[PDB]
Write a protein that binds this ligand. Structure first.
Ligand SMILES: Nc1ncnc2c1ncn2[C@@H]1O[C@H](COP(=O)(O)OP(=O)(O)O)[C@@H](O)[C@H]1O
Ligand SMILES: Nc1ncnc2c1ncn2[C@@H]1O[C@H](COP(=O)(O)OP(=O)(O)O)[C@@H](O)[C@H]1O
Ligand SMILES: Nc1ncnc2c1ncn2[C@@H]1O[C@H](COP(=O)(O)OP(=O)(O)O)[C@@H](O)[C@H]1O
Ligand SMILES: Nc1ncnc2c1ncn2[C@@H]1O[C@H](COP(=O)(O)OP(=O)(O)O)[C@@H](O)[C@H]1O
Ligand SMILES: [Mg+2]
Ligand SMILES: [Mg+2]
Ligand SMILES: [Mg+2]
Ligand SMILES: [Mg+2]
Lengths: 372, 372, 372, 372
């Protein structure tokens, strides 16, 4: 035992690797697919369930299901499939010899992390393991100790403020609007063009349309009006069956749901008011260094022109005398894993594991103690 | 028991052999002939009914009847004659010792296959037997597991799409236009030349004219116009009684019924639109590998220039960005039997038989379970 | 030009008249007779060939030949004689001034109608002409637009179904059994009584025996058994030379060939199964109004008791829930000409002619276009 | 101008009448039929296309096509024929003098309603017109202001929840399974009995079989097992040509597609889970009054025993502490038109029209404003 696995199971995409590297060696969608047709050939009981990209490669004949929804593991039997796939089929590593570092979102149910720990100890028998917080690990990546991290992933969007080492948990804001809810809204606003995507396979096509043609408009009604002369903004996409679709003002209406959650019928505030309300709940003296450090993480923060709209629209809320600075690293998509590969290689951390025997005498509630 | 019989009873031509060989050892027309004149000699009660080629050799004095029409066995007493002829007079094999593999078309009546099984168990007492699907066995021949098989035989034309082992039965398209309906249309369009074929014996002469002089025009009205200078296209045929007939633009009008079913007063679509409508009913992601694998089977797919017209006329329907590939093996006429000789020699299949005793306790509905 | 000639050249009897009248003014047998003995008087080169009733009046010294057989003109030089006789010697009309309306049977050779048109334009130089279909004109007579017409003439028997104006050409059934084949069978079954008719002159005597003493038995074996007490059914006929013949059960065996074509060694179905198979080839919704309209035409449908046997024996085939109605007009013998005298006097038809000049620039294939 | 036309063009059946009455004075199938045979009579260019019941009366010779599919008008030239037929040939009304009230399904393409408005103003020049939502008008009929309307018609099935006047558009669920897809599945499961319906005319026969012999089984496998003793459940139907067919367990397998969309190879949920998922997407406090008001509309909700299965199978999903009440009015088949005849006679609505001049200065996008 000299190296430690770092496994970030996001709600839509698993990223696993070794502690020490600057990039995960395994990045694959956290999907489990079951065949839904007959299978007339002789490969009948052959691969009764697929995981990873075989779930995505053969997705034309499968029902795809995500075991994680809103950062909460809803299907515990598929999560074991995905973990078994990561350890054995993707990293090619015996879990017996390496401590593992998992991550999860704040304000999750207590039973989620407990069952995580129980599975990791009593099924993979890892020597040690540690469950970190996804918004703390995004500061380890940026080499900071101060900032308010807005981590918008695939299931959950959370703002976490952190002063010089100290987190203020009474100002952590969680919101259940993320990338999957934008995929769902794009699937719905595309019907008014005539395109109908219903299957779970075509959901993965709309996700790819979104990751390629969607951007965040710096001003919404202004772009909505310049979309009336609907040729300077329409992009065309090529479906897998050769058909081409022409998406116009849906390119910025889909990510506007981040700033107008009323589009999908949610009574909440945008990610710009949730991050402002989180700074205004912190102490009056740290309030100035949180404006100057707005670290963004997760894939849903990779829309072209999201850091400019955040910077423009928080400045409209904050007092006009000090500066707002949105720090968007170019690799923020993996910014949670990088931090995990950092925290796990620090010598000062080598004593903050949870050892198998320590888990024995203390029970599955031992994981709740670890700095909460 | 070490070898298994493979008996493909098409609607117009029986092909039987042993599982393991690469060609059937028995290929004969599935006809039953009854004498229709007096018989003044002493061979009066001698061979009151003929089957096979004696039905075809002595066809000048017989009424010929096909027991199968449109893949449906309409005369159950003649089918037993044909089976008894295949087992005893053609393969020279006691059915008691060999399991048999029959085939039938999709979307047939349920009673057809049930009565098949009942006859094969309670009259020939085969040890085991299995009823496969004719469009799945055409992929076993081509060594594929993906493709849309267009199997045009003598009574039925069906498109069946099959992704990587899995069939999509909601897109199977059956059409009751096949080789016999083209023989009938050629018998009718030949009257405008003056030639009148009416008897069931002369039907078998028009079938031979069709199998020798008929082709599929790559463009219909273009060839129909180049047939006005009616000497560069007219072929002559020699009847059995020495007379010669001169067939001209009937050489491509007869197989055009496959692409224009309105010629025989049918409100349907050609085999090019039925195969396109079958791919467009499949899932959007498998839709690309079905264009690149259009396996053709059956004798009615042996007209010179049918794979080029299919490839040319599906490309006019599919999106212009990906390739259409019609895979026409040179022995596709037996492509359903070869597959049966393959599936029956696989060890993984040796447990998918239906044993006589298994048929006893379960009843004749046991055959409907077998992967449907 | 104000009136149009209507010339129906049947295969055995020409009926010509003027469009507008309700009966043809010229009805004569379509026979050409050549003298076959020496002619010792001085009228040597006097009338080297006879046509019409002089062919029939002087038939004791002539070889009689029909130029039309099975609705197909086999002797093109005698058909010109018959047409020249109709126009000049029977109607007494210059063809130059009147358009003509010819008729022919369905499913005839294409060259027949083309040569008809060529002769009528380049020999008689009619201004206009039109070639209609004999089974459509039988509905114009009955004032109907729906029904299945069974037109049994002297050479051909065809069933043609016609819904509300629209013909279904894929269900037209032609059969080459007609009145001449019944004359031939009566000539043969009369030998077992001892009477031998061989000459073409005595063929015209057997035809007259048939038209007077023959009927259709409502039940065949029943009448065949009541013919054993062979006095309640035997009728006597007086030959031209004063001899009397006694015909018994040949009175209903000759017309039974219409319902049992196996009598003359034909492998076909009766006129009752050919008309039932023609309705069952039509669409399922028009199938009900074709049972209720079975219009009969032609002379061969004038046997006493043929409409009752048709009505009785189709009812045995059709489902027992709806009614069969055989509509036998009392003048059906001319029912094809009446229709022609109707269609030719309709103003909506005056533009559907084929004008001499229109035939010039289009060629003899112009006549194939006319609603086929 | 004192009365207003109410024209509900469903995807399979047009219902038009006057605002104020309690029933439409015009109910006819929205079909356009083109003759597909020759037409040998003189009524050649006579009624080159039929609409309404002449499309259905003469359907034995026509190709029938629905201009609307899944609530989307696909053939804009036939929809004008159907509208011209409704106004002039069915209501006998000059459109110039009456405002009209059209309806359409939710989540349709934007261009559909725009082209509707454009045709109604620039072709029929109605003074005013209004396009309502089909699920709101079903509450006007029931005299309610609260409920979740499940409107299953011929092309589309939509759940729309409506609290006390306010609709929640983020929970509207549309599904493209409706009566036509059940007709298509019945056409397919009838082949295993031997009955083959292919034409568009026989599609209208299978629709009539479905509307008369089909019911919804309260428990599926239980009825499927009691269908093994297949005489206590088999009903016989009489085809138009007198033949009788015996339909057994297809009587409840066809409407089971509403609750098991996997039968036709759709990856969706039944109408019982789509209506439960729509209530669970609404706010937690209105959730109780939506269970107690499940208003059903459309013809596809007229199967015997559908309101009991819905009530039984939602109760299995909802919490067991409160009551589920399916409100199925006895005239729900017209429940969308009645509402239109109500909303159009309300004085508070007389100012919510779209006047011709108001459409002039605002363009065809004026219709999108009207409460969306
Ligand atoms: N380039 C991109 N532009 C917009 N959205 C993206 C992009 N890449 C990924 N996404 C969205 O981000 C999600 C993945 O983000 P990630 O942070 O990996 O989620 P998780 O934290 O659950 O692993 C995907 O669901 C996708 O919809
Ligand atoms: N060389 C050929 N060209 C065109 N048609 C052919 C040819 N050979 C056979 N056929 C047609 O194909 C039919 C036989 O096809 P096959 O696939 O053997 O039918 P089945 O599946 O019923 O056995 C015959 O009816 C014949 O009309
Ligand atoms: N009264 C009758 N009874 C039976 N057969 C008749 C009668 N009159 C004529 N025929 C037969 O019908 C034939 C004439 O029918 P017709 O319809 O005039 O023929 P075509 O259509 O060729 O003119 C004759 O050959 C004759 O044998
Ligand atoms: N009594 C019935 N039982 C079952 N289905 C019916 C019945 N009546 C009509 N239908 C089905 O409902 C459809 C008509 O429903 P309707 O609500 O009028 O459709 P639309 O909204 O398109 O007008 C028809 O296609 C028919 O298949
Ligand atoms: Mg994450
Ligand atoms: Mg075959
Ligand atoms: Mg005639
Ligand atoms: Mg409706």
């Amino acid at each position: 035992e000299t190296t430690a696995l770092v496994c970030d199971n996001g709600s839509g995409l698993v990223k696993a690797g070794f502690a020490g590297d600057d990039a995960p060696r395994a990045v694959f969608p956290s999907i489990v697919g079951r065949p839904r047709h007959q299978g007339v050939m002789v490969g009948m009981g052959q691969k009764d369930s697929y995981v990873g990209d075989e779930a995505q490669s053969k997705r034309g004949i499968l029902t795809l299901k995500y075991p994680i929804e809103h950062g909460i593991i809803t299907n515990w039997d598929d999560m074991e499939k995905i973990w078994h796939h990561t350890f054995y089929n993707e990293l090619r590593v015996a879990p017996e010899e390496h401590p593992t570092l998992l991550t999860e979102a704040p304000l999750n149910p207590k039973a989620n992390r407990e069952k995580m720990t129980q599975i990791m100890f009593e099924t993979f028998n890892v020597p040690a393991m540690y469950v970190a917080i996804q918004a703390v690990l995004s500061l380890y990546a940026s080499g900071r100790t101060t900032g308010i991290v807005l981590d918008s992933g695939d299931g959950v969007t959370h703002n976490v403020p952190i002063y010089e080492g100290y987190a203020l948990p009474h100002a952590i804001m969680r919101l259940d609007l993320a990338g999957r809810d934008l995929t769902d809204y794009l699937m719905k606003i595309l019907t008014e063009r005539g395109y109908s995507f219903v299957t779970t396979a075509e959901r993965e096509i709309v996700r790819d349309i979104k990751e390629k043609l969607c951007y965040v408009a710096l001003d919404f009604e202004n772009e909505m009006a310049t979309a009336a002369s609907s040729s300077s903004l329409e992009k065309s996409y090529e479906l897998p069956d050769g058909q081409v679709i022409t998406i116009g003002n849906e390119r910025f209406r889909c990510p506007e749901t981040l700033f107008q959650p009323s589009f999908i019928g949610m009574e909440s505030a945008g990610i710009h008011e949730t991050t402002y309300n989180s700074i205004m709940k912190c102490d009056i003296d740290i309030r100035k260094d949180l404006y100057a450090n707005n670290v963004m993480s997760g894939g849903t923060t990779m829309y072209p022109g999201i850091a400019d709209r955040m910077q423009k629209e928080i400045t409209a809320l904050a007092p006009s005398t000090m500066k707002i600075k949105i720090i968007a690293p170019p690799e923020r998509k993996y910014s949670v894993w990088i931090g995990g590969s950092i925290l796990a290689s620090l010598s000062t951390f080598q004593q903050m594991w949870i050892t198998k025997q320590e888990y024995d005498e203390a029970g599955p509630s031992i994981v709740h103690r670890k700095c909460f």
